[PDB]
Amino acid sequence: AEIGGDHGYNATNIAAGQTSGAVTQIGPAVMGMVRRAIPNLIAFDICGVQP
């Protein structure tokens, strides 16, 4: 009875490919990377520049 098993739902177990069953999977795939958006500016039409 070769049980498939699963990760203990621990984050380290998932990230390391650990599995309580027989096989240990390679990696936790890649669903993408999020980056925080740069906040927008207010422009300089409210204050004179005068370089």
């Binding site: 009875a1 049980i3 498939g4 699963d6 309580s20």
Partner: protein, 51 residues
């Protein structure tokens, strides 16, 4: 008040792969479904006149 919130989540794979007697386990039955099928009987009532 938000003290008692409403949730919904699935089953861990370690508990779902072996369901109702796999790999020697027990006391973990499935959840089953079905249909009842109940009937209603009507009666034809009469209605008449004379001239």
């Amino acid at each position: 008040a938000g003290a008692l919130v409403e949730i919904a989540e699935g089953m861990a794979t370690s508990i779902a792969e072996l369901q109702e007697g796999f790999n020697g386990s027990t006391d973990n039955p499935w959840n089953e479904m079905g249909f009842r099928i109940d009937k209603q009987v009507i009666e034809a009532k009469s209605r008449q006149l004379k001239a």
